[PDB]
Amino acid sequence: NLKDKILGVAKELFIKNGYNATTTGEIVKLSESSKGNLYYHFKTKENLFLEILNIEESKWQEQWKKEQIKAKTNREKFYLYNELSLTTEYYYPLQNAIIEFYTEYYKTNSINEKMNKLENKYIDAYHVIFKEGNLNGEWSINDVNAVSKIAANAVNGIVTFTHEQNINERIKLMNKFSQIFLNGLS
Amino acid sequence: NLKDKILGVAKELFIKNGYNATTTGEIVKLSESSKGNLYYHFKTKENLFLEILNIEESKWQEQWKKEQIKAKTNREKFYLYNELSLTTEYYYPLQNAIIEFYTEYYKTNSINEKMNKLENKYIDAYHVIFKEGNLNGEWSINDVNAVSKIAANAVNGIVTFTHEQNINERIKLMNKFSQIFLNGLS
Numbered sequence: 453n454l455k456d457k458i459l460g461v462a463k464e465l466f467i468k469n470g471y472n473a474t475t476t477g478e479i480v481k482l483s484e485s486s487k488g489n490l491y492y493h494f495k496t497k498e499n500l501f502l503e504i505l506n507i508e509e510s511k512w513q514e515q516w517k518k519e520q521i522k523a524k525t526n527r528e529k530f531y532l533y534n535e536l537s538l539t540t541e542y543y544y545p546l547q548n549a550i551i552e553f554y555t556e557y558y559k560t561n562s563i564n565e566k567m568n569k570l571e572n573k574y575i576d577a578y579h580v581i582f583k584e585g586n587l588n589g590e591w592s593i594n595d596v597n598a599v600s601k602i603a604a605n606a607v608n609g610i611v612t613f614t615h616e617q618n619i620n621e622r623i624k625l626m627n628k629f630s631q632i633f634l635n636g637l638s
Numbered sequence: 639n640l641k642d643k644i645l646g647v648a649k650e651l652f653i654k655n656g657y658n659a660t661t662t663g664e665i666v667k668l669s670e671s672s673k674g675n676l677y678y679h680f681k682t683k684e685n686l687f688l689e690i691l692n693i694e695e696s697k698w699q700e701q702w703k704k705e706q707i708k709a710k711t712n713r714e715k716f717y718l719y720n721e722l723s724l725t726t727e728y729y730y731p732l733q734n735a736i737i738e739f740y741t742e743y744y745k746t747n748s749i750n751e752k753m754n755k756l757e758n759k760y761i762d763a764y765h766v767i768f769k770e771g772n773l774n775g776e777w778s779i780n781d782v783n784a785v786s787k788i789a790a791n792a793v794n795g796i797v798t799f800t801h802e803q804n805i806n807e808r809i810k811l812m813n814k815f816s817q818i819f820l821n822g823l824s
């Protein structure tokens with residue numbers, strides 16, 4: 453494909469090198485397509501990167517819905533989502549390029565637009581879990597939105613900053629966190 | 639002193655121009671030293687930088703040692719420590735060079751190992767809070783090493799992926815997290 457085969461070459465690049473580290477010159481060569489091409493449906497570079505973040509967020513959200521069936525109660529869904537977070541191939545892998553990207557493009561009032569666009573799509577799973585858990589009487593959370601943002605970010609932090617200790621240790625610290633957290637909601 | 643001069647000159651060089659832009663040639667001349675001296679003390683730019691990172695972490699501790707006195711209980715120190723980590727990054731100078739360096743040498747066996755020892759120093763601040771909170775029946779934690787690692791990364795998450803929200807909202811969410819988390823230990 454075209455725009456679709458570029459979005460891949462980019463993803464690979466942003467993940468492998470970082471937001472700046474990778475350039476359009478690079479993208480184009482390996483993607484194999486005149487630069488101008490990129491300019492059509494991919495206005496700027498933020499547009500391309502912001503693009504990938506959306507697809508990646510969506511791919512992940514989709515994977516989770518197709519896997520959350522294995523968790524009967526919302527309590528389990530909390531535990532599970534946080535566990536899978538550590539192993540997916542989606543979105544989380546380029547959380548580091550997001551750190552760059554923000555610091556490097558953080559002074560454009562276009563900053564909080566698509567950038568908050570994601571916030572909402574990223575804390576969604578938690579909103580459902582807690583909301584539904586509230587209905588489902590698994591706990592009573594007066595401020596679902598606050599708790600979802602906290603959980604989302606706390607978890608993202610655990611997945612992103614412990615990227616060296618052996619995988620199974622991670623799975624366990626994560627489960628201890630999920631435990632302490634939910635325990636604090638009651 | 640000349641070693642100290644170099645570190646000082648280099649730190650400010652990193653702040654203004656960032657990690658990748660700062661050159662050792664500039665570091666050598668502005669500190670009135672020499673390539674050879676720089677080599678003898680640090681071997682490489684990467685290494686000189688990690689060195690600064692270590693000096694900075696000690697200042698942080700010294701700072702924390704003087705600040706925690708304002709918090710009588712450990713429950714209090716936890717809240718206070720999480721809030722300081724959030725507010726200071728708003729204006730920590732090197733923060734950028736760090737984000738820049740952090741990703742550059744994030745897949746490097748050598749550097750990544752040294753960096754992990756650096757975070758360990760951060761993580762200890764929590765260890766102390768939890769061990770002491772134990773000896774005071776503020777809570778009972780039988781896996782302090784684990785809970786410390788969780789606090790650190792959870793907090794880091796909240797501090798890192800939340801720059802779009804306004805500072806009052808971020809601080810409110812952080813104190814809420816501290817509350818939720820702390821509650822899950824009783």
Ligand SMILES: CCNc1cc2oc3c/c(=[NH+]/CC)c(C)cc-3c(-c3ccccc3C(=O)OCC)c2cc1C
Pocket residue numbers: 690691692694695697698701723726727730732733736756757759760761794797798
């Ligand atoms: C009141 C003066 N304020 C300070 C504020 C700080 O805010 C920081 C925010 C961050 N924001 C999230 C992306 C990250 C990553 C590191 C920080 C460090 C840090 C940087 C390099 C090497 C060691 C440390 C360090 O302190 O390491 C162990 C504690 C830091 C240090 C001091 C003194």
